[PDB]
């Protein structure tokens, strides 16, 4: 009974690592809310110059950046590096990918991969932990596998201190493994580390990049696209808002990781009609301003009603229905699915769907009162009241 | 250890809800055999003239119409009203689409579905509500999201009063929304109706019918089929009976909602030998007659041996062996598997595929004892003794 | 070029098999219409207690069923008999009974036979789709027959004939059946004059309540109703009705390349100017008549004119075509080169075009072009 | 036959189309590389206020954009209109934003137009997929317009012309549309002599941002950056980059059967040999010149010369190719006949080989087997 | 209508290009027959201390090894190099080994070399899919060589030659791949006179236990045994048997479109007549002789003789096809142009069909068409 939730509040995070380049703050997994839908948050900020050392998870993260830019890399295994840079080699590793605020970023299960901060002001990015993910064969727990640093725990509510996995191994055996010396060895270890997960790389970070076979696909796996530019909008109306879907249709590598998003935008006023989702769970992250959001269930009864704001998450149950209506400064925010293809439908729509009769019959209404309802007024789901 | 069960009992509805214009019965979803199964069934009674109103589940469902005829129609989000009536447009709305007793019907995860009896005798019809599929992302329990009327709850046993979706929202925020004005958008909240969730139509209901891009496919998606018509039969011996398999190859939305189903009609004495199904567990439910079943474990023990008549339900979990033999009357019924391409295996045929001296040694039985068991005899699952 | 066509013609079969229990009458494939959709049809009649012998051929067939009603029955390789009357008396797979309306479908290479069950005549329009990409002989309609001796369905590809079974002698025939000289001798039908359709006297019997890997596949489903009204999937009470056969009602099409429609226009229904995105189309009008026009990328009618019952009109891919049913409507059936062939009418095209791209384009006036967009009725199907 | 080809020409355009505002210039179907690849190209500019009337071709399109910004808006087949601005003033399609370095792909059979946002003209390459498996019509390219009077583009394939509207009369129009002679009258573009490409005096106005089934399928991603430096999957700061488009980053692709790779050669830069395991490629150069070199299975190179900025190369499957910036660099786009075009560069190959293996093969010493191997950059693009 | 054939052939090699270490023969792609199954076929030899040099072509082979044992290195492209002897003195993809009775894949474009690492020679007969649907260029076979001076093995399609490095100077080549004008000489083959195989005197040495992206695709199953006894799929101890391998038993081939069967027929043991649904079939006798006949669609034989060991005959697709030992038994492979072939056997047929409608179609008696349905063995394999 994960789901059978009578209240729905509108959360905050609940636990703070404060790092030498950085912040991550995390939702507590427990909460009944993200229990029934079956994830975690996390937010991330990465100070200037700020890199998150390298690390994989057992299921996939969708990130939105909503601050900020820089850039991630990946470790696809046992693809090539195809980023060279000759002294004979200097160096060279895989590619570099950069990103904006507005962007999604995906993180294979499994996979490690790095973020740093390019530019001046910080960088913040919330993460969907997709906990509940089938590919997940561990169990509800969200894990961070760390290949680097000395880090703090993230989720600890999962404790009932950290270490990088490579702390895990003598050095003695580091020094062989990797064929290399005892000294090296020991600094894999991260020994006298106090820096955290999220360091601070002075003077700045150098890598190979433009701007700063199975390599043509499968090793260059797209994973980050953006989703909140205005023109990228799906649905629109000029005095309500826009509504933006990012799915499999857009970045393939979704379908196996069983996650979509939307990106809303509600102006003044602006109103998106009762909804729902088909089928998937979804949880909503305010990137900016303020409106009233109201959830209600299968009984009619109205699990969540009231305002959320900038910095609070509100899961929305698949099947609840939901609507929202932009505050005085508007309305912005993501809305993450626990589906590849995550489909909804709104009222007005299904109205439209319905025969008249049907429609007379079920709400006792006449038929002029109907043909205003099937045929009168904008079309979509954004309303301009 | 949900399906370690020493005993299977011939289970009957449990709860009623009995409404203006027909009747609502539902099995609790807490038998331990039905937990087993991950499932619940529903019957419903749509008397003369009466109207399911409309509503969806987070799960699909598959019905069997057992008496009577009718329409049904879903909402499809998006899809075009492809059934127009012009006066420019009276009215307009999605494919009504025809059912008769016999006939199988499927509701999509999430799709809104009404349905309306057009004949004089009452609609019956039972429905498997598959709560564990995968496509449920919940909870276990059953849930019916009503979008008009004053509904009964329908599956108690889960509250441990009904309202529709609706009903959830101020009429001023619906008629915001719905761009219409407070006494309609009060309307829509069903304040007074005391009909509950099957109304009936005074007068007869009237839709446009025929008879009474991707609108092509996808909006069209077949949704019933017939099962239970004696053509159909894809096994069969005039003495004993038939046997008739609705699947994904011929409904092909079945293979994203995990279910198919076989409709067995056993002449008096008529014998459906040891067989069993290999990936998926079964729901049986008895339309007509009465006859002898036996449900053996992996033990060699039988949970279940006794008669089984019209109305009752009777589960038979993933591999465990059943076997079926018609009364005096004989014996019809449908059942329900969890699986989209349920396969299944009978004994003899499964002697016919060993070495005939492998047999021999498993049995202590003669070249000619074996001989008789693989080669003599009819060949097909149905015996006529 | 073969679809660089300046002219399109209604055709009417060119040529004729009269057998002893029915007749067959075949459209020649090398009109240029047919080579361009890469496909010919056949039409069929069986009268009462006709039996059309077993055969098979390279590529799919999709039938559809005018007049009658009767029972096909395919042999799949290595399925089991599923149809068995008590030693057996006799066993067989699974026998499928279709009526007028209905749509069979022949998968490449799987031998089938039917029988008439009724007193009328059947008849049925099959169309061969020789160029489908299953087939790896050439585009030559072929017809493998089991038994008898038939004459060539198909004259135009030669430019006699028995089944496969006269192509061995009747002492291997012997031998490779473990059976007598006598009965392999009759296996190669030699004096056997009845044709490729023959008359059961006394009637056929067979297996069937009205007269594993079988599960599913060795029984998968090959026939569709697709004419009845009820099964519309656009509709329009003034004007006609539009149904779809395709992948997602029948699944076996999806390896077959084939879909359908069923038309029926009432007096004077239009529907309006369309085309197809992804097949090239073929028209059979199965009653009454109407005026057809055909637009290639020229902005040339390469066919307008009357079609009526019995014709057939090919409407290659992205070809723009309207309809209009005459004094008594006009009913037919579209088949298409396509497992999920779809198409697109040109209001709703102006309907998903901004305002200012329409009014630029036309030279229109806002008014005007508010007038295509929200005025009459949405769908395809138009009450003039 | 049509890929036996002995040589290889760099072709430039041999048509062209002047139209009120913009052009069209074309390279004939008929040239014998263009032949063995099975499409043509086709250069679209569109001048200040440019609108480029709906059209649709049975065939999917690739198009990088190579100057300019504009707006693309496609008409897809029952899908709702998600942009509306309020009765409605108007509601239309999601309208798609695009500039230089963007890839559009053009589905089969769906209309769209585009119209110029900026000041500059919007030029862009059009690589028109003829023989793609959706065509079954043949391998001539067409352009089937909804509205105006436009001059034949691809002239080699007649061996006039207007709308597919233009093949109705205006009495049936009406009808058809429910709309009044005048409208349908002005619907079939009698007296438009402004040509396929229109200037919007004034400039276009359209519903957008900046200026169910609908969440997928209905909106699905039609476009692509593939220029800018940071979407490189190859990088060698002295040497170039390469950037691939293809169903892994745009899955609309799988079902066209098309993908790409934007090349950047530096000064003296070289993508050493490779070839494309599964697919034909058409080189087209969109700045700088360089060296190219195109060897086939008897190792004569069947091209081997200069190749600049506007000129096209078609460099069949499986030919071995290698490029060189010359002074001021190389930049071009490379469309590759399938969704997933594979490549292989030799040095790979030497490294996936044993060492004895080489040695025998190449008659070399184990210490110059150790050279190929093991010496150098080991990615595709050198710096010499 | 290049399968309109009144006449099959039981071809043998026409040509032979002699080499240092080997020899290979090959059947002309002109052969009718061959046209009609859109492939052609090579037998290759390797002697003694045998390296066939790297090359590659356009579409899939399947090869079937009739005699000796070897290796086989594949060149994956962007592939790690899994193989490693420690500096590293040398790495290289994975080795895979084969013996007689294995057949091997080669997938289009993929670099491939084999080596005897026995004392008898190699002898294989490869199947070349020229018709495969991956091949964008035409009908023709060719083979891109990475090394050596070859002879053209297939010269019918000219109606010299060197390798792709040929192709290149040697002063490009040292820039390419960073090495100096020596080894780039040497890399062209310029003095080379042992043709495509060569030996490798005192035998080669690679590194291999018995003489991510890695654990999938980089190192797919590409060899596979048919021929061993105890892998039967069929089997009579009295008549024969038949093994069949298709994409469910190697995976790749799903994407190559072709599959084999391998049959083993005992003296007088007769395959009783069957034909293939959706595959035209290439038949190649590795063993013994016997009597093999073709029937088309008119009932006429058109192959009625011996086969014996060396001798291909093809068997278009739906034709009727029966076999029977001689005295000393007969063994072949079948190689089938589809990942899945199916074929039916008509004894089978008589059970899937209804007594009666066997009764009416041969005018047999219903203790007679007990006596087909019944008796005997049910399998195809039968002992006369
Ligand atoms: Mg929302
Ligand atoms: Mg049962
Ligand atoms: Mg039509
Ligand atoms: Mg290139
Ligand atoms: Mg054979």
């Known amino acids: 009974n994960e789901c059978q939730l009578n209240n729905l509040n509108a959360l905050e995070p609940d636990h703070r690592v404060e790092s030498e380049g ?28 700020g890199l998150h050392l390298p690390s994989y998870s057992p299921y996939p993260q969708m990130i939105i950046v909503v601050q900020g830019k820089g850039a991630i890399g990946f470790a696809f295994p046992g693809c090539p590096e195809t980023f060279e840079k000759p002294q004979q080699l200097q160096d060279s590793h895989q590619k570099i990918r950069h990103f904006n605020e507005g962007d999604v970023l995906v993180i294979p299960p499994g996979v490690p991969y790095w973020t740093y901060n390019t530019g001046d002001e910080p960088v913040v990015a919330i993460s969907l932990l997709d906990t509940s993910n089938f590919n997940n064969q561990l169990d509800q727990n969200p894990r961070v596998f760390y290949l680097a640093g000395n880090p703090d725990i993230e989720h600890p509510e999962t404790m009932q201190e950290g270490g990088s996995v490579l702390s895990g191994f003598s050095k003695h055996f580091l020094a062989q493994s990797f064929n290399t010396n005892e000294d090296t060895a020991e600094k894999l270890r991260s020994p006298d580390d106090e820096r955290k997960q999220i360091v601070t790389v002075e003077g700045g970070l150098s890598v190979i990049s433009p701007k700063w076979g ?14 909140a530019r205005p023109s990228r909008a799906d649905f629109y109306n000029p005095k309500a808002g826009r509504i933006s879907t990012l799915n499999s249709l857009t970045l393939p590598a979704l379908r196996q990781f069983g996650l979509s998003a939307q990106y809303v935008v509600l102006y003044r006023n602006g109103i998106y009609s009762p909804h729902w989702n088909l089928n998937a769970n979804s949880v909503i992250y305010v990137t900016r301003g303020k409106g009233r959001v109201r959830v209600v269930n299968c009984q009619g009864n109205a699990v969540f009603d009231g305002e959320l704001r900038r910095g609070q998450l509100l899961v929305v149950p698949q099947n609840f229905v939901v609507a929202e209506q932009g505050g005085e400064q508007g309305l912005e925010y993501v809305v993450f699915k626990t589906h590849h293809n995550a489909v909804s439908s709104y009222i007005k729509d299904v109205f439209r769907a319905i025969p008249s009769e049907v429609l007379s019959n079920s709400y006792n209404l006449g038929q002029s009162q109907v043909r205003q309802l099937k045929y009168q007024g904008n079309s979509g789901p954004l309303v301009n009241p």
Chains 1, 2 share one sequence.
């Open 22 to 49: 950085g912040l991550i703050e995390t939702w507590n997994s427990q909460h009944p809310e993200l229990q029934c839908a079956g994830v975690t948050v996390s937010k991330r900020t990465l100070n200037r110059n």
């Open 214 to 227: 199975v390599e043509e696909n499968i090793c260059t796996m797209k994973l980050h696209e953006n989703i």
